[PDB]
Design a protein around this motif. Structure first.
Motif, mmCIF file in Angstrom:
data_model
loop_
_atom_site.group_PDB
_atom_site.id
_atom_site.type_symbol
_atom_site.label_atom_id
_atom_site.label_comp_id
_atom_site.label_asym_id
_atom_site.label_seq_id
_atom_site.Cartn_x
_atom_site.Cartn_y
_atom_site.Cartn_z
ATOM 1 N N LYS A 1 0.985 -1.252 0.185
ATOM 2 C CA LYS A 1 0.010 -0.054 -0.047
ATOM 3 C C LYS A 1 0.862 1.254 0.070
ATOM 4 C CE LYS A 1 -4.149 1.540 0.137
ATOM 5 N NZ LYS A 1 -5.209 1.225 1.370
ATOM 6 N N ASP A 2 2.037 1.178 0.660
ATOM 7 C CA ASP A 2 2.692 2.392 0.927
ATOM 8 C C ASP A 2 3.654 2.786 -0.412
ATOM 9 O OD1 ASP A 2 2.665 0.417 3.420
ATOM 10 O OD2 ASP A 2 2.480 2.825 4.324
ATOM 11 N N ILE A 3 4.164 1.597 -0.900
ATOM 12 C CA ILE A 3 5.135 1.706 -1.858
ATOM 13 C C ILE A 3 4.163 2.363 -3.287
ATOM 14 C CG2 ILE A 3 4.931 -0.668 -2.370
ATOM 15 C CD1 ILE A 3 7.250 -0.610 -3.944
ATOM 16 N N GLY A 4 3.139 1.484 -3.485
ATOM 17 C CA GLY A 4 2.104 2.320 -4.411
ATOM 18 C C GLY A 4 1.441 1.113 -5.159
ATOM 19 N N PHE A 5 1.451 -0.174 -4.586
ATOM 20 C CA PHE A 5 0.762 -1.334 -5.341
ATOM 21 C C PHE A 5 -0.454 -1.275 -4.576
ATOM 22 C CE2 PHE A 5 4.009 -3.093 -8.344
ATOM 23 C CZ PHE A 5 5.357 -2.340 -7.803
ATOM 24 N N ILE A 6 -1.737 -1.253 -5.483
ATOM 25 C CA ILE A 6 -2.999 -1.327 -4.813
ATOM 26 C C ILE A 6 -3.595 -2.505 -5.433
ATOM 27 C CG2 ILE A 6 -3.247 0.917 -3.828
ATOM 28 C CD1 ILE A 6 -3.779 0.189 -7.718
ATOM 29 N N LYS A 7 -4.472 -3.379 -4.664
ATOM 30 C CA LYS A 7 -5.278 -4.339 -5.382
ATOM 31 C C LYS A 7 -6.372 -3.827 -5.773
ATOM 32 C CE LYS A 7 -6.343 -8.113 -3.049
ATOM 33 N NZ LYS A 7 -6.185 -9.473 -2.261
ATOM 34 N N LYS B 1 11.814 4.104 -11.088
ATOM 35 C CA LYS B 1 11.849 5.373 -10.515
ATOM 36 C C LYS B 1 10.665 5.580 -9.690
ATOM 37 C CE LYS B 1 11.035 9.427 -10.336
ATOM 38 N NZ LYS B 1 9.742 9.378 -9.672
ATOM 39 N N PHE B 2 9.615 5.024 -9.931
ATOM 40 C CA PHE B 2 8.425 4.960 -9.246
ATOM 41 C C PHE B 2 8.544 4.094 -8.209
ATOM 42 C CE2 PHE B 2 4.659 7.502 -11.122
ATOM 43 C CZ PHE B 2 5.534 7.934 -12.066
ATOM 44 N N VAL B 3 9.066 2.647 -8.436
ATOM 45 C CA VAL B 3 9.315 1.819 -7.574
ATOM 46 C C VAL B 3 10.350 2.339 -6.443
ATOM 47 C CG1 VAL B 3 10.601 -0.174 -7.103
ATOM 48 C CG2 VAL B 3 8.600 -0.538 -8.357
ATOM 49 N N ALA B 4 11.186 2.971 -6.965
ATOM 50 C CA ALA B 4 12.258 3.366 -5.744
ATOM 51 C C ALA B 4 11.705 4.531 -5.083
ATOM 52 C CB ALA B 4 13.712 3.868 -6.657
ATOM 53 N N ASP B 5 10.850 5.382 -5.398
ATOM 54 C CA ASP B 5 10.267 6.347 -4.534
ATOM 55 C C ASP B 5 9.497 5.865 -3.643
ATOM 56 O OD1 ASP B 5 7.496 6.609 -5.463
ATOM 57 O OD2 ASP B 5 8.319 7.512 -7.562
ATOM 58 N N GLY B 6 8.700 4.561 -4.129
ATOM 59 C CA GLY B 6 7.868 4.001 -2.949
ATOM 60 C C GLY B 6 8.659 3.330 -2.089
ATOM 61 N N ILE B 7 9.905 2.640 -2.189
ATOM 62 C CA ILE B 7 10.506 2.055 -1.198
ATOM 63 C C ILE B 7 11.073 2.965 -0.484
ATOM 64 C CG2 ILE B 7 10.962 0.005 -2.824
ATOM 65 C CD1 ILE B 7 13.854 1.114 -3.044
ATOM 66 N N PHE B 8 11.569 4.317 -0.768
ATOM 67 C CA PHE B 8 11.937 5.425 -0.114
ATOM 68 C C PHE B 8 11.053 5.817 0.946
ATOM 69 C CE2 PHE B 8 15.726 6.520 -3.033
ATOM 70 C CZ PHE B 8 16.585 6.093 -2.059
ATOM 71 N N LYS B 9 9.692 5.784 0.368
ATOM 72 C CA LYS B 9 8.775 6.274 1.292
ATOM 73 C C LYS B 9 8.641 5.278 2.401
ATOM 74 C CE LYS B 9 5.765 10.011 -0.100
ATOM 75 N NZ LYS B 9 5.523 10.814 -1.335
ATOM 76 N N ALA B 10 8.641 3.937 1.963
ATOM 77 C CA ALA B 10 8.357 2.873 2.951
ATOM 78 C C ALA B 10 9.277 2.913 4.053
ATOM 79 C CB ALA B 10 8.314 1.679 2.294
ATOM 80 N N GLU B 11 10.650 2.970 3.669
ATOM 81 C CA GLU B 11 11.688 3.188 4.384
ATOM 82 C C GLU B 11 11.357 4.257 5.607
ATOM 83 O OE1 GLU B 11 15.416 2.686 1.426
ATOM 84 O OE2 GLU B 11 16.341 2.583 3.131
#
Lengths: 55, 101, 97, 120, 126, 74
Positions: free
Chosen positions: A47-53, D8-18
């Motif tokens: 949910k946080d990274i950006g992957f939504i079901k 880049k989208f996946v990387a910013d997502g993982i950065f936000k999760a971190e």
RNA sequence: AGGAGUGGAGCCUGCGGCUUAAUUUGACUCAACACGGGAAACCUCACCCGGCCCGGACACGGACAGGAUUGACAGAUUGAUA
RNA sequence: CAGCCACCCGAGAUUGAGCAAUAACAGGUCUGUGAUGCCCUUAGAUGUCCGGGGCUGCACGGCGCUACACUGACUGGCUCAGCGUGUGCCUACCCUACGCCGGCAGGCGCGGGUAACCCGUUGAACCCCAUUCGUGAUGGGGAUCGGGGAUUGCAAUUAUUC
């Protein structure tokens, strides 16, 4: 032994060259799109990274 | 030189459309030509993973989808107005790449 | 494995002048690009830090395979008075305002 | 060098999760509610949303400064290219994370489960 | 009788000419481990070859030598030495004919065999 | 699965034995009626070798081992 | 009502039988078994086996100033860098 | 009435999934976890070194396979119907067009690609089907080991060889 017997052949590529970037676990990793997590950590943080079901 | 391409991208289409309207209206308010918002195909990142954290249970999967929406807009204008319009405090969640070709 | 003293002295000095060390270290390989120039095995640093925690002078936090340390007045004073490194070196944890 | 857009989208997502996990572990005593992130060219601004501001800024703005370091040294930003601020969320009872933290804190102080739940 | 011909290609005629142009016509397989070069990581095989050919000439089983290498092949002088696997559990002793050049089945030594099969009867359904 | 099962093998076998010594004196060239060193021996004009180390003679293998190279004239 | 199917007329693995372990760690099924995203020649749960280790480098019972920390190596150093 | 079954100005008259309640299980996971209660002590410690090797000691009454045949053939027919990956930030290890070694696995070389921009108009069936079917052991296997020559990875012995 410390630096004399090991490191004499290419072995930098095995499964032990990877680990989950959240918990340092080497099992069930996700390489796709490079987020490099295990199954469960990715399910936790999807949910946080950006992957939504939606499917 | 009058060839400038701006790349707009976001996961949320609402913000993407709002910022695209912002750019188009900013270009057209002052006497200036601008191309329509070229709408590139959406990219659907798909990842499927077993729900369970173990081996027990019926094999139920999770299909996480991630939609990336990206547009390209052309500009035949001096770089000063382009730089002014780019620094307009865009809405969050949108990644912009302004290229002077 | 090698147990030196002046390498650890240099590591202590960099820790004092920074607050945290920035050098990825691997137990398996002697040298990593970040580890280099500070050639002390990871195991040495984390065992010394675990001994330090068993004693207790410094603050820490952990997140996503990473340490984040905080050197307070106690650690500054301890590194000052043990290694007889004079206070001509000013800590980097109190810069600005 | 530059990477692909999906990466880049996946990387910013993982950065936000971190970042979210880090500030939940670190700012677990103030009462942590959330984060907002905004981007301008080479200027990335992060805001920590919490119920107590006078407690999160710290003495002479120590912690708020220190956080910058543990961002700068970790996320790999160029020196002095990261800025971060602190504002207080308007309400508290409408954020599920905030009330979960409050209940966690109440159970950390030994207050009984049923009365803490009734209070929240 | 019939001697050894290299899979329908003459062998004595092959040795009739010089030696520098045989690497240009070197057979398939069993050259990769030393394909990094005729350099280090090779002296052990030739040391064992000299060992065996000094303790046992060709057409003979060698004396206590257990090499696990495929013995990169150029001629059926490989006989007189044995590729053997040493563990304390693996011990093969077979005299193999000198017809092996770069081709199939020059090795009868095997590192596994079927384990004791029990009784297959006593019912199949309940 | 089952454990290592490496405790009961290798019977009537002993470890390789390395001599316990207190000082490294006779390891070097010491035949001068006093144990001192002369200037007739040459020093290698290369930087990869330590100045302190000096050539020595051993009736076996060699005075070396980390790089596993014999330094004898042979 | 049918179609495709099945330890039968190939291919991949999960029991029909086990003591140089050889496989079943989750089963009262259908909610164990091509499931632990578990295709182990990476060091796989090591597995079975002549495997150089110390991975005590948590501060305070004995503690030396060498815990003893290599070898491509000619039958006497009987495996490709134990 | 709620509704149901068929259709006369008429594109549309049950698409498939996601989410999915209260109460429960001594269901599974402490071998995902910096998510954690209750622990062990002393030598080739489960972490380095294991040439060889773990289910492979196995007979289509557990997924994915054979149509005794014009519904089926090897381009005289394709201006095609068609998910989604892909390179160096830790980290060398990505997708590959085009020439040569070539009548080919595999090797060499400059080239493109952070991607509707290059692979690519992705070789996702060949519908007249220019070797070409009469009582169909015999195109519905060819119950598979010989051959230009056999791998960017120590180990291919029940295994990416092609």
């Amino acid at each position: 032994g410390h630096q004399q017997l090991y490191w004499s052949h290419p072995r930098k590529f095995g499964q032990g060259s990877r680990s989950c970037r959240v918990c340092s676990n080497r099992h069930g990793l996700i390489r796709k799109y490079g987020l490099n997590m295990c199954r469960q950590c990715f399910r936790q943080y999807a949910k946080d990274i950006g992957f939504i079901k939606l499917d | 030189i009058h060839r400038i391409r701006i790349t707009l991208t976001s996961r949320n289409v609402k913000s993407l459309e709002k910022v695209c309207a912002d750019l188009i209206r900013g270009a057209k308010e002052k006497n200036l030509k601008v191309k329509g918002p070229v709408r590139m195909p959406t990219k659907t990142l798909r990842i499927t993973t077993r729900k369970t954290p173990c081996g027990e249970g019926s094999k139920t999967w999770d299909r996480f989808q991630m939609r990336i929406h990206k547009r390209l807009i052309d500009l035949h204008s001096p770089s000063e107005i382009v730089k002014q319009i780019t620094s307009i405090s865009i809405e969050p969640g949108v990644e912009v790449e302004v290229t002077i070709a | 494995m090698l147990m030196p003293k002046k390498n650890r002295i240099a590591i202590y000095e960099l820790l004092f002048k920074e607050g945290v060390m920035v050098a990825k270290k691997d137990v398996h390989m002697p040298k990593h690009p970040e580890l280099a120039d500070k050639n002390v095995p990871n195991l040495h640093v984390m065992k010394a830090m675990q001994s330090l925690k068993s004693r207790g002078y410094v603050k820490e936090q952990f997140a996503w395979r990473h340490f984040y340390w905080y050197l307070t007045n106690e650690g500054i004073q301890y590194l000052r008075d043990y290694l007889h490194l004079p206070p001509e070196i000013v800590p980097a944890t109190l810069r600005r305002s | 060098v530059q990477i692909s857009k999906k990466r880049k989208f996946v990387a910013d997502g993982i950065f936000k999760a971190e970042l979210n996990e880090f500030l939940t572990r670190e700012l677990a005593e103030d009462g942590y509610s959330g984060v907002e992130v905004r981007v301008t060219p080479t200027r990335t601004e992060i805001i920590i949303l919490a119920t107590r501001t006078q407690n999160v800024l710290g003495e002479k703005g120590r912690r708020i400064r220190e956080l910058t370091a543990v961002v700068q040294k970790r996320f790999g930003f160029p020196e002095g290219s990261v800025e971060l601020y602190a504002e207080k969320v308007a309400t508290r009872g409408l954020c599920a994370i905030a009330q979960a933290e409050s209940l966690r804190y109440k159970l950390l102080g030994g207050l009984a489960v049923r009365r803490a739940c009734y209070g929240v | 009788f019939r001697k050894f011909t290299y899979r329908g290609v003459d062998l004595d005629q092959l040795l009739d000419m010089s030696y520098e142009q045989l690497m240009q016509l070197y057979s398939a397989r069993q050259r990769r481990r030393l394909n990094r070069g005729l350099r280090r990581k090779q002296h052990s095989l030739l040391k064992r070859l000299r060992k065996a050919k000094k303790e046992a000439p060709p057409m003979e089983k060698p004396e206590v030598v257990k090499t696990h290498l495929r013995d990169m092949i150029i001629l059926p002088e490989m006989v007189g030495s044995m590729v053997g696997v040493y563990n304390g559990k693996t011990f093969n002793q077979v005299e193999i004919k000198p017809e092996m050049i770069g081709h199939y089945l020059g090795e009868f030594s095997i590192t596994y065999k079927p384990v004791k099969h029990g009784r297959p009867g006593i019912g199949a359904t309940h | 699965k089952k454990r290592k099962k490496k405790s009961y093998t290798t019977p009537k076998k002993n470890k390789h034995k390395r001599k316990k010594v207190k000082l490294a004196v006779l390891k070097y060239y010491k035949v001068d009626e006093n144990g001192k060193i002369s200037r007739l021996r040459r020093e290698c004009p290369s930087d990869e070798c330590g100045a302190g180390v000096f050539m020595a003679s051993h009736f076996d293998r060699h005075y070396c081992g980390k790089c596993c190279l014999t330094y004898c004239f042979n």
